[PDB]
């Protein structure tokens, strides 16, 4: 348990990012940061899967 072992936390960080994108839906900046939370989250999965 890396405290909710990292990758299970990647989603939560990624979960909250939608709250931010939800908070500013037209303001794309929230998407960008949210997109990174997507992209790192996927990579760690690939790395974990690896």
């Amino acid at each position: 348990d890396l405290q909710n072992t990292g990758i299970l936390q990647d989603l939560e960080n990624y979960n909250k990012a939608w709250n931010d994108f939800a908070s500013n839906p037209n303001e794309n900046a929230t998407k960008i940061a949210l997109v990174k939370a997507s992209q790192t989250l996927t990579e760690s999965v690939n790395n974990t899967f690896a």
Partner: protein, 50 residues
């Protein structure tokens, strides 16, 4: 009016949104249905012996 008519919304649910505004039309051109027509003659009337 220049805006959507959905509400600004945020999801916190097992299938729940959260609306927290009013679209601009709903003030700008909103049907305040309680009120009624005020119809008048543009002409005015008098005795005309004088």
């Amino acid at each position: 009016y220049y805006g959507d008519k959905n509400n600004i919304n945020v999801v916190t649910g097992a299938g729940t949104e959260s609306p927290y505004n009013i679209p601009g039309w709903d003030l700008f051109f909103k049907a305040d249905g309680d009120y009624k027509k005020q119809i008048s003659t543009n002409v005015s009337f008098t005795d005309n012996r004088w």
